Symmetry: C2
Subunit: 351 residues, 2 copies
C-alpha cells in the first residue's frame, strides 16, 4: 500500500483507456509527421487546457524535456553561469533544492507567509540572482495569486532578478489557471516557467517537462538544453496532446472531483483523532499533509512500514530547517480509493 | 533528405512492428507488475543480447535513465565533485565534450592510435582523474579490443583513475560483444559504463541510457541520479525487453545485414569518384565517414544543403583540433535504403562537379 510517491497510480478513465488502445495509430502518426507539428499541437492543447493562453507559441520558445527535473537540471546549471544565490520557497519539493545546490547555488529560504503576504525585502532581493516559486506548491498546495505574481514579477524586473516558477501541480487547482504568461510578459522581468505533465494523469511516467523562458532571460538555457537532448519522443507528445484533449472534454473536472473525493476520505478517517489536523485546509493538490502531536513523522513512517504502508515524513520538504516538518507526514492522493482508504485506516490506528 | 542525425529512422521490421501493435498490452502489463521486475527483465534481455553476461544484476546497480545524455550529465556532474581534468578520446561524439566542459572539467585529448596502440603514459594518468572512451567510437566505428581494455583498466587501477566507457554503438559491432564487465571487474579499477538503447532501433526516441558503475566508483553518482529521476517508464522498459528479445531471435542479425547493405550502397555510389576515400574500412557502425582531397567538409555540407540533403561535416567531432576533420563528412546509415540512395546520389553529383 504505497501512499508516498506523488505520481498518479489510479485507474485510467474510459476516455484515457481509449487513448491507450490507439497507441498503434499514434505511433503511425508519429512516424509520418514532423515532430515539430505534433509538438506544437501538444503544447497548444496543454497550455490552453490550463488557461495559459499567452504562452509563447513560436517554435523553439517552449523546450520539451524528458521530465520537469531534467528541465530543472538545465535551469540550475544555467543559473550557475551568472548567479551565486537563489531565494527558494520553503518548504517545497526537495529535488529543486538538491539540483540548485548540486550545481553550486547557495540557497536562501523564503517562507510561504513572507512570499504570499508581502513584497520581498530589498535586502533579500539584493542578495540573490533568482527567486524560485513552486505554484501550486508541493507539498502545501498553496497557490500564488495573480496579484502577488504581478507584484513579484514587477519587483524582479526592478531588481534585475530572474523569476522562476515550477507549475507541475497547475492542472489540479483552478486558482492556478489564470494566465501566468500574460502577467510575466506585461511585467517585463527575466522569467522562466517549468510546466510538467507528469503528476496529472496515470501515464506510467510518460511525460514531458516544458521549459519556457523570456527572450531576455540572459541564461544559457537553450545551449545547455541542446547538450542534454534534441527533443522528446513524438509518441509522448502525441499522448500529451490526446490526454489534454480528453481533459478539456470533461476529464479535468472528473479529475478534480476524484482528488476531492480522496482528500475527503483521508480527512473523514483522521479528523476525529485528538491533536490530528490538516495544515492545508484549502489545498486541491494530489498530496495531503497531516499533522499530529506527541510523535514525529519519522516515527509514524517507521510504524506504518511495519504494517506495509508507505507514506512520507515531511522533514525532507523543509529543505532549510528539517525539524519544521517533524510533526507532519504527506499522503499521496493520486491512488485508487480502496487502497487509499485501507492505508489511512492503518494510519488512524497508529496516530 | 536527412542523413545527419545518428538515430534510427528506417521502417520497423515485422518482428518489431508486432511489438508496436501490442503496445496496449505492454501498457496493461506495466499497470499490473512492479516496475522493478520489468526493469530487471529489460536489463537482462539487453545485456545478454550483446554478450555482457557479467553485468551487475542485483537490483539498483544498473540505473535506468531517460537517455544516455542524461546518464552523461549525471556522470559529468558527479566527476566534478573531485576530478578537474578528463582524458577523452579524440575524435568523438562532441556532446560528451560539451557536457564535461559545461560541468567544469578540463579536457585532454587522446588520439585513437595512441589509445588503442600503446599504454597511456604515467604523466597523463597523474594529470587526469578519468579516462573516457567511446567504443565503438562515434564517428569512426573503432572498437576497443579486449586486450587494450584490460590494460587500460589495469593502468586506471594502478593510478586510482576512473575508466568511463560510452557503449551506445555496441549493438552494431560484434567485436564489441566480448564481456566488458568481466574485464572491468577483474581489473578492479573504478569504472563506469553508459549503455544506450537509443541508436539501435526505430523506436521514436523511446529509449534508455543504462548507467552502470563499480561499487568503489567514489563519485556521488547515485545521489545525483536520484536528484534527477526516480526511474524510467515501465512501458519503455517493456519495449526495450521486447525489442531485445526480437533482436535475439534473428533481429540483430538482420540489423547488421541492413547496416552492411546501406554501407555498401554508400561506398559503391562514391568509390569511383576522384579524391574520395573511406577512412574506416572495417567500421560496422550506423554512421559512415567519407573523405575527399579536393575540398572541405564544410563546403560539401553547404552545397549538399542547397540540394536539400542534410549530412554533417566532421570538424565538430574533432573537439580539440577541428581542422583534423576538415576533409570529411559523416553519413547516417540508420535510414530506409531508398532515401539514403537518393542522398548519396546528390553527394556523388556534387563531388563530380
Ligand atoms: Cl511528489
Ligand atoms: Cl549521432
Ligand atoms: Mg561541438
Amino acid at each position: 500500500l504505497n501512499i508516498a510517491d506523488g505520481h498518479a497510480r489510479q485507474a485510467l478513465s474510459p476516455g484515457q483507456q481509449k487513448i491507450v488502445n490507439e497507441l498503434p495509430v499514434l505511433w503511425a502518426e508519429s512516424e509520418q509527421r514532423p515532430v515539430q507539428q505534433i509538438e506544437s499541437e501538444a503544447h497548444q492543447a496543454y497550455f490552453t487546457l490550463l488557461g495559459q493562453h499567452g504562452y509563447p507559441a513560436e517554435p523553439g520558445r517552449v523546450l520539451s524535456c524528458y521530465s520537469s527535473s531534467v528541465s530543472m537540471e538545465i535551469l540550475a546549471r544555467s543559473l550557475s553561469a551568472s548567479v551565486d544565490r537563489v531565494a527558494l520557497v520553503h518548504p517545497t519539493f526537495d529535488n529543486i533544492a538538491d539540483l540548485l545546490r548540486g550545481n553550486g547555488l547557495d540557497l536562501v529560504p523564503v517562507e510561504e507567509d513572507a512570499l504570499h503576504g508581502a513584497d520581498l525585502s530589498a535586502e533579500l532581493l539584493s542578495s540573490v540572482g533568482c527567486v524560485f516559486v513552486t505554484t501550486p506548491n508541493n507539498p502545501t498546495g498553496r497557490v500564488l495569486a495573480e496579484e502577488r505574481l504581478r507584484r513579484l514579477a514587477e519587483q524582479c524586473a526592478e531588481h534585475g532578478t530572474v523569476l522562476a516558477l515550477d507549475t507541475s501541480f497547475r492542472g489540479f487547482d483552478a486558482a492556478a489557471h489564470y494566465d501566468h504568461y500574460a502577467v510575466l510578459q506585461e511585467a517585463g522581468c527575466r522569467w522562466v516557467v517549468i510546466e510538467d505533465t507528469g503528476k496529472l494523469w496515470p501515464t506510467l511516467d510518460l511525460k514531458a517537462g516544458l521549459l519556457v523562458f523570456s527572450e531576455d532571460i540572459g541564461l544559457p538555457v537553450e545551449k545547455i538544453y541542446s547538450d542534454i537532448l534534441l527533443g522528446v519522443s513524438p509518441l509522448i507528445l502525441a499522448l500529451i496532446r490526446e490526454f489534454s484533449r480528453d481533459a478539456a472534454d470533461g476529464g479535468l473536472a472528473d479529475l478534480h472531483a476524484f482528488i476531492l473525493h480522496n482528500r475527503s476520505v483521508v480527512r473523514r478517517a483522521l479528523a476525529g483523532v485528538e491533536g490530528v489536523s490538516f495544515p492545508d485546509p484549502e489545498s486541491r493538490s494530489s498530496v495531503e499533509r497531516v499533522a499530529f502531536a506527541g510523535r514525529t513523522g519519522t516515527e509514524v513512517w517507521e510504524e506504518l512500514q511495519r504494517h506495509h504502508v508507505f507514506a512520507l515524513p515531511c522533514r525532507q520538504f523543509h529543505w532549510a530547517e528539517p525539524s519544521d516538518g517533524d510533526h507532519m507526514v504527506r499522503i499521496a492522493l493520486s491512488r485508487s480509493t480502496e487502497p487509499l482508504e485501507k492505508s489511512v485506516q492503518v494510519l488512524r490506528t497508529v496516530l
